[PDB]
Amino acid sequence: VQLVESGGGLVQPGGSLRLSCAASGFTLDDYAIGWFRQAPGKEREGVSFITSSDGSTYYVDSVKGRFTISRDNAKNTVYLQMNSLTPEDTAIYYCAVGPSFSYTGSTYYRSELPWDYDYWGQGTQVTVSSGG
Amino acid sequence: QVQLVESGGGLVQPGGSLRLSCAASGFTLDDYAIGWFRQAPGKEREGVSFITSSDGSTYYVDSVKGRFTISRDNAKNTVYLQMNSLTPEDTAIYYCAVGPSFSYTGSTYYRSELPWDYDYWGQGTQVTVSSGG
Amino acid sequence: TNLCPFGEVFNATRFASVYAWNRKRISNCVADYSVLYNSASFSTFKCYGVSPTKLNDLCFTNVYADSFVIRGDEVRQIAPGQTGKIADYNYKLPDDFTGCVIAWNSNNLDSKVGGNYNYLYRLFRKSNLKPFERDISTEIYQAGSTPCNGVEGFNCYFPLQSYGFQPTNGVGYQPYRVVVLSFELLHAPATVCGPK
Amino acid sequence: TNLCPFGEVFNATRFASVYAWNRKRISNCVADYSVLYNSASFSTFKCYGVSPTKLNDLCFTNVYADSFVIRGDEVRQIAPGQTGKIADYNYKLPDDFTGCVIAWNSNNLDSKVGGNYNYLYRLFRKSNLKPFERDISTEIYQAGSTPCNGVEGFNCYFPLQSYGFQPTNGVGYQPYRVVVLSFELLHAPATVCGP
């Protein structure tokens, strides 16, 4: 299982940025995908998750509304759309493959803990600075 | 299976002497490189004392140099870390790491201050040094 | 319309230790599941064999709630078909398990400056625990050939191990309160059902 | 008594990136190994197939020093018979390797408030690198069936990946300067020897 992250970069406050996590070697729909945010010197914190294979999504209160996570089966890529970005959202973002719904009995799976998710991908830095 | 059991630890007065014993089971202590690690609350584990070579050569970090002595007992299959002149700054959780085997690899001298390098880990034992109590 | 006492289980001042987890059987009440899945307080929500939206329609004979406090790393261990020290010797979940495991961070409530060592977990046990089995016996663990004879000694260790639970501890080491919901329909009558 | 230029290798203002590691061949000098193992500055010191005390007596035809900066987690990867992304696609160590790998923390030197993105590592490569082989080519990596054709696109990614290297980053993410010493006696004359 290989995860490739795309997007990220310097953004002005209030900017809209889209992050794409490539999926290879597994079916995206079966697994539960959770996006994680890591602040410098801090543990990774979950922001948006694919709770169910049906496509139900849960957003943390901090990122609720502003952040929308979408899954494209045809391209086998999961897209996280970030809007109204703020300086507090400057951190490294990760995508987690998670447990497979089909293999396990799980119907709803969401976790904010990095250890729970089975697989990890390289981080992509997203920086929002008013000064530049 | 490799199992590590830690012994000792507790409240100590400043300048107190405490001995920490890490039990070893399922492997030969001499072959592997044993490194003691100290974890401060909210901080990554930091190596303090290590068994660099199978011969028994030991390396101590400058902070713990002299005060901390690490000894290996083959007969009891336990590695002992002796701590002397303890200070409040030494209040942290202490771990013992099995490390890579010298015989299996080509390593003759092995020491690392990074937790990831060491192959195996054992449960931590809290050591607290407080002047107040 | 007598609501099931979910708040009592979730909003409990005292939670049992991992080694002796507290089980509460809930029945003969109209269970409200909406509050559980509509609340963002819970850090981790996992449902196995059941769907949270579907829970309201479904009727279950009995519901079992298991309450314990564990480290952040240990939260992963408590799942069906997952191997961990906590799973092996403290709390065991059946592979064929229907229910939802809910975990939320309790760092502020269960961490003090000295550290909360009241919570204990069974580091050593003779055999892996069978599913939904609780071991509370405090007997010195024997590892070497020599008999412990009830006295602490070399190669003999007390099973229970304290949790540091400092406030400044990292998220992995921070205390996490976990409530595990088990839904059983084996009994012929159905009582809890849901909200109508 | 012309000492070998160990200080130049270890005390170097600029260190090469992981993908294009810098190799320096040292010979025809009296190498002093005592300073390396008598210094507590190095966080990690590993010797494979050689003993640091015995190094002074031993004579080697050539010594190769490899300098690169890696993350704290990646330090574990660079070892004989160890599998990692850095090992697989950036720097590869032979299983039958004689030498010492030395790593020390360089957080203060190589971290700036904005972050030092100059250092790069090869995230994607077609095949695992053979031991002591350096790949510097910057060609777009192809993963899907569709040809990249030299243009960045979906399923086509630039191999090099920047390192955040922030000052506040954790010890695992902090930059670590690593010097790998390779001792070769295959050549018939012995030059470096010791003190």
Residue numbers in the entry:
A (entry chain C): 2 to 133
B (entry chain A): 1 to 133
C (entry chain B): 333 to 528
D (entry chain D): 333 to 527
What did the published study say regarding this structure?
Here we describe the isolation of a nanobody that interacts simultaneously with two RBDs from different spike trimers of SARS-CoV-2, rapidly inducing the formation of spike trimer–dimers leading to the loss of their ability to attach to the host cell receptor, ACE2. In the prefusion conformation, the spike is a large homotrimer. The RBD is responsible for the initial attachment to ACE2 and is found in two distinct conformational states: The receptor-accessible ‘up’ conformation and the receptor inaccessible ‘down’ conformation. Binding of Fu2 to the RBD is unique as it can simultaneously interact with two different RBDs from different spike trimers in the up conformation.
Our high resolution (2.9 Å; 0.143 FSC) localized reconstruction of the RBD-Fu2-RBD-Fu2 interface helped us elucidate the molecular details of this interaction. Each RBD in the complex provides two binding interfaces for two Fu2 molecules, which we call ‘interface-major’ and ‘interface-minor’ according to surface area covered. The interface-major and interface-minor have a buried surface area of ~740 and ~495 Å2, respectively. Furthermore, a region around the Fu2 β-turn A40-K43 plays a key role in dimerization through interactions with two proximal RBDs. Specifically, one of the two proximal RBDs’ T500-Y505 region packs against the Fu2 A40-K43 β-turn and the RBD Y505 is in addition bound by Fu2 Q39. Meanwhile, the other proximal RBD is bound through a bidentate hydrogen bond between Fu2 E44 and the backbone amides of RBD V503-G504. In the complex, Fu2’s long CDR3 (G99–Y120) plays a significant role in RBD binding.
